[PDB]
Paper text:
EHBP1 was originally identified as an Eps15-homology domain-containing protein 1/2 (EHD1/2) interacting partner that plays a central role in GLUT4 transport and couples endocytic vesicles to the actin cytoskeleton. EHBP1 consists of an N-terminal C2 domain, a central CH, a C-terminal bMERB domain, and a CaaX box at the C-terminus that is a substrate for FTase4. In our previous work, we showed that EHBP1 is an effector molecule for Rab8 family members, including Rab10, and forms complexes with 1:1 stoichiometry. Our biochemical and structural data suggest that the interaction between the C-terminal bMERB domain and the central CH domain has a regulatory role in the function of EHBP1 and binding of Rab8 family members to the bMERB domain releases the CH domain, which can then interact with the actin cytoskeleton.
Since we were not able to obtain wild type bMERB:Rab8a crystals, we attempted to crystallize these mutant:Rab8a complexes, finally succeeding with the mutants of the full-length bMERBM1116A:Rab8a and bMERBF1120A:Rab8a. We were able to solve the structures of the bMERBM1116A:Rab8a and bMERBF1120A:Rab8a complexes to resolutions of 1.914 Å and 2.0 Å, respectively, as described in materials and methods. The complex structures are quite similar, and we describe the bMERBM1116A:Rab8a structure in detail. Two copies with an overall similar architecture of bMERBM1116A:Rab8a complex per asymmetric unit were observed. Similar to previously reported bMERB:Rab complex structures, the major interactions between Rab8a and bMERBEHBP1 involve α-helix 3, and some additional interaction surface is provided by residues from α-helix 2. Hydrophobic side chains of Rab8a switch I (I41 and I43) and switch II (F70, I73, and Y77) are buried in a hydrophobic core of the interface formed by α-helices 2–3 (Y1149, L1156, L1160, L1179, L1182, and V1183). A conserved triad of aromatic amino acids (F45, W62, and Y77) also forms hydrophobic interactions with V1186 and L8, F45, and I47 of Rab8a interact with V1193 of the bMERB domain. Several polar interactions were observed between Rab8a and the bMERB domain, including between side chains of T4Rab8a-E1200, Y5Rab8a-D1197, D44Rab8a-R1189, D44Rab8a-Y1149, Q60Rab8a-D1190, R69Rab8a-Q1176, Y77Rab8a-N1187, and the F45Rab8a backbone carbonyl forms a hydrogen bond with R1189 side chain. To unravel the structural basis for the release of the CH domain from the bMERB domain upon Rab8 binding, we superimposed the bMERBH1-2:CH complex structure with that of bMERBM1116A:Rab8a. The first two helices of the bMERB domain adopt the same conformation in both structures, while the third helix of the bMERB domain in the presence of Rab8 adopts a defined conformation which would infringe spatially on the CH domain binding site, suggesting that the CH:bMERB:Rab8 triple complex could not be formed because of a steric clash.
Numbering used by the authors:
A (entry chain C): 1074 to 1203
B (entry chain A): 4 to 174
């Protein structure tokens, strides 16, 4: 379902490519006074393109944040299951290289939870706005 | 769209049912298998409360002393903490005093606390009477609830309470 994200990023550049032209055409009038009718038409559409662009960036932002979360969750879930199997083995049985790598993995599991907690602070960031 | 963000914390001895309480409340699930928590984790459930939506971030801690240092690092962020014991395990109840120490030593002074006597479905093995639970919590000025994650007794109550209690400092 993440393909929608990529569909949106191509949409955005098309918006930005057309807004690019419109903005130069709208600023082309105005810096002259060449036409002020055609001009409001341009101003009408520029404004339309601007929060079409903004609506989309907001939807993209939430989609990306969702994707990173599902990613982190599944990485956490798999590393948790993994180290459950590892810690379940007695310590007198493993090389020390592996007791030390277990500690590294433990630290890794904690970093993942913190990365997840970062997205939470990130998500309520983007939601103070509307 | 959500309105609020409250960070909660579960602490207590290994085996008292912190994860099951959290899973009941978050996933409406219950595991009979004892799968010990490694270090620290959290879940989010956004609830509908008093005409108003609130997202709760609830941190679940490993009860084993092996992870004690890791877990204590997460205390200062909590807006509210559940101290959990097992009503079928006298020793876990005895340890509530120690866990009260770590809260007051490492959380915010205004952090809101709540003791849960979990596994209140298990009558034949009750080692801690509700009256001994209720009066300990009165003694600490702490709210008290007996819960069962298994029977889904007072879990929603427990968190919905702790959160209305948080909200109440607003308003
Ligand atoms: N009968 C009953 N058993 C419960 C209840 N809550 C948890 N248990 C059981 O008690 C065991 C431990 O629960 P768990 O939630 O993993 O405990 P924990 O406090 O998170 N342990 P840890 O700190 O090691 O991660 C499990 O076998 C679980 O099914 C309850 O309300 N009633
Ligand atoms: Mg647990």
């Amino acid at each position: 379902v993440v393909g929608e994200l990529a569909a949106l990023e191509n949409e955005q550049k098309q918006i930005d490519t057309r807004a690019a032209l419109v903005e130069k055409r709208l600023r082309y009038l105005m810096d002259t006074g060449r036409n002020t009718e055609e001009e409001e038409a341009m101003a009408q559409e520029w404004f339309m393109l601007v929060n079409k662009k903004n609506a989309l960036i907001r939807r993209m932002n939430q989609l990306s944040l969702l994707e990173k979360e599902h990613d982190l969750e599944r990485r956490y879930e798999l590393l948790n299951r993994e180290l459950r199997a590892m810690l379940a083995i007695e310590d007198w049985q493993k090389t020390e290289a592996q007791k030390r790598r277990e500690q590294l993995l433990l630290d890794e599991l904690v970093a993942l939870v913190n990365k997840r907690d970062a997205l939470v602070r990130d998500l309520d960031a983007q939601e103070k706005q509307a | 769209t959500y309105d609020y963000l409250f960070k909660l914390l579960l602490i207590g001895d290994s085996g008292v049912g912190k994860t099951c309480v959290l899973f009941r409340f978050s996933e409406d699930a219950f595991n009979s298998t004892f799968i010990s928590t490694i270090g620290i984790d959290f879940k989010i459930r956004t609830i509908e409360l008093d005409g108003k939506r609130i997202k709760l971030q609830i941190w679940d801690t490993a009860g084993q002393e092996r992870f004690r240092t890791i877990t204590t690092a997460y205390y200062r962020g909590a807006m509210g903490i559940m101290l959990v014991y097992d009503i079928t395990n006298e020793k876990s109840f005895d340890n509530i005093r120690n866990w009260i120490r770590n809260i007051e030593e490492h959380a915010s002074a205004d952090v809101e606390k709540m003791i849960l006597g979990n596994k209140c479905d298990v009558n034949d093995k009750r080692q801690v009477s509700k009256e001994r639970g209720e009066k300990l919590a009165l003694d600490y000025g702490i709210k008290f609830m007996e819960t069962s994650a298994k029977a889904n007794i007072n879990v929603e109550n427990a968190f919905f309470t702790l959160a209305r209690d948080i909200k109440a400092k607003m308003d």
